[PDB]
């Protein structure tokens, strides 16, 4: 009928407004498009990947350009502890004059936004110093984006179109990605650190016009080629070194000091260089594992077929799994998302405790924003990983080709897995909520000594084994005569033990009963989100209520009111339910991070230690207490620069609430309402001169779940971002 969903004639012949919505929502599900083949599917995905890479490089170019043009990067470089970094300028014609005055910050000549992304600390650490450096980087990245766009166009041309078998050559791709994309990139980064970033940290101005003239080490490359590699570790930067200057600097380029630079409170750059060099060698070696065209290397199908326990404990083992993984893009995407999202969480956990950028640890707003940002990104990615696992089970799983292997066998005891996840979720919820409520009642009745405060002795024992002597467990790195102690004593242990025994950093924070309770809340959240996702994936193909669910696909509204009623029976609906639990879980995690760090940054650890053991403590001493500056961003007396966060705070509350409408009220109410509206327009004079092209209808059942979830999530994120940034930046 129409030609907009040109990939779907079924949508194109829809006479209602549903055609537009579904045309948008199905545009990137290339496998379900009309007349698609496997080869054309892979080629379209390859080009789309080029487009995404170009978008990423353009985004980075824009950040560099706006900081270079409108920021205060040289001024921040001069005084990194007393200059608020500027993100970009504000040109808003709706501003009143008090808003123009309030937002003028950081030494800017006009209203600006203060950055929370940490790009100043990162770019300063890696050696950038001037606006010209940032501009040149931005121009280079714009050119890189243009190159990626050209390559995406080019490999869609018929003579440059890669064959389907090229996409399924797993061994060559793994060899090249491990050796070059990981290893050579890390080696080149070590080159940048040694030639540029380390000299710039020592006051030496090294750029493209003089780096062939500048010696990175006084003895050149002779210690490298002779194998006398300990020369490069001699004479590190002293503990009195001032970053960016030659005062107190050394000449070492590859060290293993451990711990932090005393002034910047961040990792030593020479340690970072040695890290990336060792990583480069390990990854280049690992990229020579798989067989390509030279008669040596492993064959992955035979590796998988060989790994079956001879006692039969895993049935057929991993037999046939090579073709299962290699033929399913959803299996590959599920694996990629699970691993990348776990890595994103690892980045969040390691960047707060081991800050890698100079003057990042002292920037409290930036640290809180980065932790929260990456943990929410990690949560969304993990939900997607399990979603595409469910999609694999529906669309790509062939039971005959996987007969008796580990995949079929875990499908064969899915009730055991789901029921045990249910048990652990129930145990954690019952007992964590019960201990919190008991403590709340104890505080309410005036008897806090009757609280149940369980000491986290296992994690404290771990902290002791890594050298924290506060808890009195004398073992390993906290035992001065142990073998583990003596082995590291001349290499990384002095700096590490200085850092881990200081309470002025975030390295292995002191923990107590509040940390116990919130960690068990986190365990409850992880296990329940996993339960919903895993039950969705394992029941995706069918259940007792709907034994032919695979015939209906990943996403469908329901199977009607029969058989007791079947709302939210699809695996997609399990994803939709699990997003709520993921948001809840990351909320608990980030609440914990922010409140514990708020106490640490304000120099009062007793507030978290005493109030976090009961939930009124969380409400009153975290949410209520820290919202005071935020909600006074504008008031009857006037406004300040926090008024944008007050407005966005309310904006997020509104969007969150609007989502409840789509989630609570369901379709048929709105369809009858829209029918009366369609009657009204046709019968109204001067208005019935105009007519709709698409028949107005209520949003579909699944679309409503999506739109409600999107409003809920966006309001969740916007509200917490406003509260986090306003509460931290109004104090710091």
Ligand X SMILES: CC1=C(/C=C/C(C)=C/C=C/C(C)=C/C=C/C=C(C)/C=C/C=C(C)/C=C/C2=C(C)CCCC2(C)C)C(C)(C)CCC1
Ligand Y SMILES: CCCCCCCCCCCCCCCC(=O)OC[C@H](COP(=O)(O)OC[C@@H](O)CO)OC(=O)CCCCCCCCCCCCCCC
Choose from ligand CLA, ligand Y, other proteins, none: what does 381 bind? Cβ within 5-8 Å by kind: ligand CLA
CB of 435 to ligand CLA, least distance (A): 12
Report helix, strand or coil for 506: coil
CB of 4 to ligand X, least distance (A): 15
338-347: burial string, b at 16+ Cβ within 10 Å, e else: beebeebbeb
User: How many angstroms separate the CA atoms of 687 and 79, rounded?
Assistant: 64
Residues 361, 583: contact at Cβ < 8 Å? no
Choose from other proteins, ligand X, ligand Y, none: what does 389 bind? Cβ within 5-8 Å by kind: ligand X
Length of the chain: 732
CB of 148 to ligand CLA, least distance (A): 7
Choose from other proteins, ligand Y, ligand X, none: what does 292 bind? Cβ within 5-8 Å by kind: none
Residues 287 to 326 in contact with ligand Y, rule: CB under 6 A: 309-311, 313
DSSP string for residues in 662-689? HHHS-HHHHHHHHHHHHHHHHHSTTTTT
User: How many angstroms separate the CA atoms of 664 and 662, rounded?
Assistant: 6
Cα 590 to the chain's mean position, in Å? Answer: 13
Helix-helix angle 701-731:364-391, to 10 degrees: 160
Tell me if 389 contacts ligand X by CB under 6 A: yes
Tell me if 697 contacts other proteins by CB under 8 A: yes
DSSP string for residues in 467-493? T--TT----GGGSTTSHHHHHHTTTTH
CB of 556 to other proteins, least distance (A): 7
Q: How many CB atoms lie within 10 A of CB 361?
A: 22
Q: Check the annotation: does 624 bind a ligand.
A: no
Tell me if 49 contacts other proteins by CB under 8 A: no
DSSP 8-state code for residue 250: -
Give the per-residue contact string, 187-226, with ligand Y (x = CB under 6 A; - = no).
Answer: ----------------------------------------
Within 13 Å, how many C-alpha atoms sit on residue 349's CB side? Answer: 10
The piece of 111-119, 236-244, 328-336, 679-687 that touches ligand X (CB under 6 A) is: 328-336
DSSP string for residues in 2-51? -SSSTT-HHHHT--BTHHHHHHHHTTT-GGGSTT--HHHHHHHHHHHHHH
**Nearest residue (CB) to ligand CLA, 108 versus 370:** 370
Tell me if 466 contacts ligand X by CB under 6 A: no
Helix-helix angle 513-538:414-444, to 10 degrees: 150
Choose from ligand X, other proteins, ligand CLA, none: what does 615 bind? Cβ within 5-8 Å by kind: other proteins
Query: Could you tell me the two tokens for 394?
Result: 């529906």
Closest-approach residue to ligand CLA (CB): 429
Report helix, strand or coil for 730: helix
Residues 554 to 593 in contact with other proteins, rule: CB under 8 A: 556-570, 573-574, 577, 580
Q: Tell me whether residue 487 is exposed, middle or buried, using C-beta atoms within 10 angstroms of its C-beta: 0 to 12, 13 to 18, 19 or more.
A: exposed
User: How many angstroms separate the CA atoms of 1 and 505, rounded?
Assistant: 65
Cα 86 to the chain's mean position, in Å? Answer: 24
Tell me if 47 contacts other proteins by CB under 8 A: yes
Q: How many CB atoms lie within 10 A of CB 675?
A: 13
Residues 444 to 463 in contact with other proteins, rule: CB under 8 A: 444-447, 450
The piece of 11-19, 166-174, 192-200, 343-351 that touches other proteins (CB under 8 A) is: 11-19
Residue 223: closest CA among 213, 233, 212: 233
User: How many angstroms separate the CA atoms of 214 and 403, rounded?
Assistant: 63
Tell me if 710 contacts other proteins by CB under 8 A: no
- Binding residues for ligand Y, rule: CB under 6 A, are 309-311, 313
Output the known binding site: 28, 49, 52, 59, 66, 70, 88, 91-92, 94, 113, 116-117, 122, 155, 166, 172-173, 175-177, 189, 192, 195, 208, 274-276, 288, 292, 297-298, 307, 318, 349-350, 357, 373-375, 388, 409, 413, 420, 423, 431, 438, 450, 458-459, 463, 519-520, 527, 558, 567, 653, 656, 661, 669-670, 711
Output the known binding site for chlorophyll a: 28, 49, 52, 59, 66, 70, 88, 91-92, 94, 116-117, 122, 155, 166, 172-173, 175-177, 189, 192, 195, 208, 274-276, 288, 292, 297-298, 307, 318, 349-350, 357, 373-375, 388, 409, 413, 420, 423, 431, 438, 450, 458-459, 463, 519-520, 527, 653, 656, 661, 669, 711
Output the known binding site for phylloquinone: 670
- Binding residues for ligand X, rule: CB under 6 A, are 51, 54-55, 58, 331, 334-335, 338, 342, 385-386, 389, 392-393, 537
């Amino acid at each position: 009928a129409t030609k907009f969903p040109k990939f779907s004639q079924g949508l194109a012949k829809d006479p209602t407004t549903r055609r537009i919505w579904y045309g948008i929502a199905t545009a990137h599900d290339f496998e379900s498009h009309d007349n698609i083949t496997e080869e054309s599917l892979y080629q379209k995905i390859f080009a789309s990947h080029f487009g995404q890479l170009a978008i990423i490089f353009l985004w980075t170019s824009g950040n560099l350009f706006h900081v270079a043009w409108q920021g205060n990067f040289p001024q921040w470089v001069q005084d990194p502890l007393h200059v608020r970094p500027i993100a970009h300028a504000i040109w808003d014609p709706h501003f009143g004059q008090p808003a123009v005055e309030a937002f003028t910050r950081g030494g800017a000549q006009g209203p600006v936004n203060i950055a929370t992304s940490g790009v100043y600390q990162w770019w300063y650490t890696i050696g950038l110093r001037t606006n010209q450096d940032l501009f040149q980087g931005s121009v280079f990245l714009t050119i890189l984006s243009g190159l990626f766009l050209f390559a995406g166009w080019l490999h869609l041309q018929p003579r440059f179109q890669p064959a389907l078998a090229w996409f399924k050559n797993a061994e060559s791709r793994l060899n090249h990605h491990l050796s070059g994309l990981f290893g050579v990139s890390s080696l080149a980064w070590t080159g940048h650190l040694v030639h540029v970033a380390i000299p710039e940290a020592r006051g030496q101005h090294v750029r493209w016009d003089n780096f062939l003239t500048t010696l990175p080490h006084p003895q050149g490359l002779a210690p490298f080629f002779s194998g006398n590699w300990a020369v490069y570790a001699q004479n590190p930067d002293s503990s009195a070194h001032l970053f960016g200057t030659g005062e107190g600097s050394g000449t070492a380029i590859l060290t293993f000091l451990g711990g932090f630079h005393p002034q910047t409170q961040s990792l030593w750059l020479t340690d970072i260089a040695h890290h990336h060099l060792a990583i480069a060698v390990v990854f280049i070696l690992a990229g020579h594992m798989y067989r390509t065209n030279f008669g040596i290397g492993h064959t992955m199908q035979e590796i998988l077929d060989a790994h079956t326990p001879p006692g039969g404990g895993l049935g057929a083992g991993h037999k046939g799994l090579f073709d299962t993984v290699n033929n399913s893009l959803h299996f590959q995407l599920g694996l990629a998302l699970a691993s990348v999202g776990t890595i994103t969480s690892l980045v969040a956990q390691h960047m707060y405790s081991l800050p890698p950028y100079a003057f990042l640890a002292q920037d409290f707003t930036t640290q809180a924003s980065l932790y929260t940002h990456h943990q929410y990104i990690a949560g969304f990615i993990l939900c997607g990983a399990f979603a595409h696992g469910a999609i694999f089970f529906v669309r790509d799983y062939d039971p005959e080709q996987n007969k008796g292997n580990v995949l079929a066998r875990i499908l064969d005891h899915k009730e055991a897995v789901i029921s045990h996840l249910s048990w652990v979720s129930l145990f954690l919820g019952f007992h964590t909520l019960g201990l919190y409520v008991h403590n709340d009642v104890m505080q309410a009745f005036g008897t806090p000594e009757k609280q149940i405060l369980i000491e986290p002795v296992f994690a404290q024992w771990i902290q002791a084994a890594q050298g924290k002597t506060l808890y009195g467990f004398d073992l390993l790195l906290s035992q001065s005569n142990s073998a583990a102690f003596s082995a590291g004593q001349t290499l990384w242990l002095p700096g590490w033990l200085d850092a881990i025994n200081s309470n002025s950093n975030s390295l292995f924070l002191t923990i107590g009963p509040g940390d116990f309770l919130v960690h068990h809340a986190i365990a409850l959240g992880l296990h329940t989100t996993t339960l919903i996702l895993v039950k969705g994936a394992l029941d995706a193909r069918g259940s007792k209520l709907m034994p032919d669910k695979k015939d209906f696909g990943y996403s469908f509204p329901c199977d009607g009111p029969g058989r007791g009623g079947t709302c939210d029976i699809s695996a997609w609906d399990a994803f939709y339910l699990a997003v709520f639990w993921m948001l809840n879980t990351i909320g608990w995690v980030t609440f914990y991070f922010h409140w514990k760090h708020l106490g640490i940054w304000q120099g009062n650890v007793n507030q978290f230690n005493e109030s976090s053991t009961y939930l009124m403590g969380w409400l009153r001493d975290y949410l209520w207490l820290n919202s005071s500056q935020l909600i006074n961003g504008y008031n009857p007396f006037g406004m300040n620069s926090l008024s944008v966060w007050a407005w966005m705070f309310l904006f997020g509350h509104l969007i969150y609430a609007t989502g409840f409408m789509f989630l609570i009220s369901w379709r048929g109410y709105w369809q009858e309402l829209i029918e009366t509206l369609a009657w009204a327009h046709e019968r109204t004079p001067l208005a019935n001169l105009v007519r709709w092209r698409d028949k107005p209808v209520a949003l579909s059942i699944v679309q409503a779940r999506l739109v409600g979830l999107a409003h809920f999530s966006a309001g969740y994120i916007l509200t917490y971002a406003a509260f986090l940034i306003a509460s931290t930046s109004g104090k710091f």
